[PDB]
Design a protein around this ligand. Structure first.
Ligand SMILES: *[C@@H](O)[C@H](C[C@@H]1CCNC1=O)NC(=O)[C@H](CC(C)C)NC(=O)OC[C@@H]1CCC(=O)N1CC1CCC(F)(F)CC1
Lengths: 303, 303
């Protein structure tokens, strides 16, 4: 193959935070950090409320004693509850002894993260996802998976970035950050909702081209450059995302490692888009990969 | 809705330690009061071309082995060698030891790898034991002693310990009794593998996974006999399909209503005609590192 593959972060620090939250007969997953459990607010809905729920009214009718929180078979007593956007925050009487160093981050399209898919508070598997430009992810989620989280780990600190809420008609998935704000335009109701037309993650294609150069595969490098605006206007004609200044910056380490300026690599990509690859391959493939971030490439090339 | 998924790695993370001998550092697996690691940790540069391991190990003392679990040193009180694995007895039991067994896997079976550096887990990903007994891994300097495993309920079945990279960029290692998979040797030489083949039963399982996810452009109205399929498979360097494989595909055949030999006729058409620009589950190549069990376990939410 190419020598690259989707690699998840070790999941143990997150496994130590997964619980189950049940209201009535609806059980989903929650995230237990310090003395708070975070979960999707739709745990409070019946099937009838799910079409057009009045979450404020549904929450007023609930009390602490209506929430069953369990780590395994052991009940965790709820002593407070509140709603923040689309997440429920349940205060519990016990601080999770396995709480890692953590933060809540809201990621940008193109960023990757590891998903720990869980059912009934028990982990089933871990895999890497990329946030698409239309603010959906291509996950593997079944009934009961809501409240599963996405995360990255930097040193000993877990950055939680995603909590799972729903599946769209096209089979892709949508959710919130850990403050309960949906990524994209979606809402937590049982209605038909369409993702926007997706586009290719340009910053990650550029990271892939840098990866190819690092590995000595550099036939596509040209002697030209472009402005960022000129590249963005061309990129959009090929259903590629425009680059942001942040994208330019996150390509900084790979540009320094190879000596190829970001805008020079943009000119090389522009020629690939306009001319095609013409039977040639990059890292063994005629298809450009868009789900490895600059961070993923450096991790797999340099450690 | 179908992803390459690793097992949650937490049970294994709690067992990883750092082992140092001389200027060589790699990872060890700490279970109860024993640390398992690759024996080549005892080699020097003047040794590694033809290391007489029994003669090298008798010359070592317990204090020549530095074992560190986080920021704590584990005192080695004894040592022994089993094939290519060194077993360091320490004076403390690991309270994080999971229920476990050591298993030797078959070509075509999959497992999760917890890649580690300096005793610290770094990433987790799914691999298959190739028919030529290599694995297409992601391992850098210092990764030796990283392990591969499966989980069933609460029991971790360790099947792989990492030892080496081959000139082609694939990897080789042992079971936890220290016996290599394949014709490889723990000496510092460039070693080639036998010719690899594609894991046919796994390709078929993945085509079924594609149909389960609504992708059926590759199906056809035709069927084949088992022997006629195998003749074509062998011509294309695919492994033979046995009646046991056909039986193992039964549940996926029953779920989709597509007979195994009908799917074999679809695969035959893909081998002879190619995919012609189209993709299956997002892949431009036929994927052979999902077993039939992996497909079922993912389409059923097993935790
Ligand atoms: C763990 O100690 C380490 C893991 C390797 C490092 C790179 N990626 C990995 O997975 N294993 C080794 O260093 C191992 C040690 C011997 C004693 C078994 N050797 C090894 O993996 O060697 C890999 C290199 C690179 C590809 C290749 O052919 N070789 C062998 C090397 C032999 C000496 C040489 F001079 F001929 C150069 C090539």
């Amino acid at each position: 193959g190419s020598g690259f593959r989707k690699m998840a972060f070790p999941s143990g620090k997150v496994e130590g935070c997964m619980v189950q939250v049940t209201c009535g007969t609806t059980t989903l997953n929650g995230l237990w950090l310090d003395d708070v459990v975070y979960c999707p607010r739709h745990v409070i809905c019946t099937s009838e409320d799910m079409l057009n729920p009045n979450y404020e009214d549904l929450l007023i009718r609930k009390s602490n004693h209506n929430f069953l929180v369990q780590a395994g078979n052991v009940q965790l007593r709820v002593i407070g509850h509140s709603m923040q956007n689309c997440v429920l925050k349940l205060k519990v009487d016990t601080a999770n002894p396995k709480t890692p160093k953590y933060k809540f981050v809201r990621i940008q399209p193109g960023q990757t993260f590891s998903v720990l898919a869980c059912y009934n508070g028990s982990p089933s598997g871990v895999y890497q996802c990329a946030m698409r430009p239309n603010f959906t992810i291509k996950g593997s989620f079944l009934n009961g998976s809501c409240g599963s989280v996405g995360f990255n780990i930097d040193y000993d600190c877990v950055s939680f970035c995603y909590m799972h809420h729903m599946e769209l008609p096209t089979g892709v998935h949508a959710g919130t950050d850990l403050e309960g704000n949906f990524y994209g335009p979606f809402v937590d109701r049982q209605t038909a909702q369409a993702a926007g037309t997706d586009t290719t993650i340009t910053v990650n294609v550029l990271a892939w081209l840098y990866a190819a150069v690092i590995n000595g595969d550099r036939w596509f490098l040209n002697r030209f450059t472009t402005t960022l605006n000129d590249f963005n206007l061309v990129a959009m004609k090929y259903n590629y995302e425009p680059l942001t200044q942040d994208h330019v910056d996150i390509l900084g380490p790979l540009s320094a490692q190879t000596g190829i300026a970001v805008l020079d690599m943009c000119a090389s990509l522009k020629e690939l888009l306009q001319n095609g690859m013409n039977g040639r391959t990059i890292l063994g493939s005629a298809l450009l990969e868009d789900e490895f971030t600059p961070f993923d490439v450096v991790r797999q090339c340099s450690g």
